[PDB]
């Protein structure tokens, strides 16, 4: 259902499958690990990708 989210905090990956981002970036959601962790990549920078905490984003699209 959810396709685009906007990050609301900074986040540094703790593990090598995790996405590092700053606040204000758009993520394209491409998958889910669980209710607290989704998978995606940066809109406009798809090479930046990985697992990220859902609590760190606001739903934007879909």
């Amino acid at each position: 259902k959810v396709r685009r989210v906007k990050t609301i905090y900074d986040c540094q990956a703790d593990n090598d499958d995790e996405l590092t981002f700053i606040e204000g970036e758009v993520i394209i959601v491409t998958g889910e690990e669980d209710q607290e962790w989704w998978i995606g990549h940066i809109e406009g920078q798809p090479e930046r990708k990985g697992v990220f905490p859902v609590s760190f984003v606001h739903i934007l699209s879909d």
Binding site: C11, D14, N15, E36, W37, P53, S55
Partner: peptide, 7 residues
């Protein structure tokens, strides 16, 4: 603002 644990 705590990051939930990976599991």
């Amino acid at each position: 603002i705590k990051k939930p644990v990976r599991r």
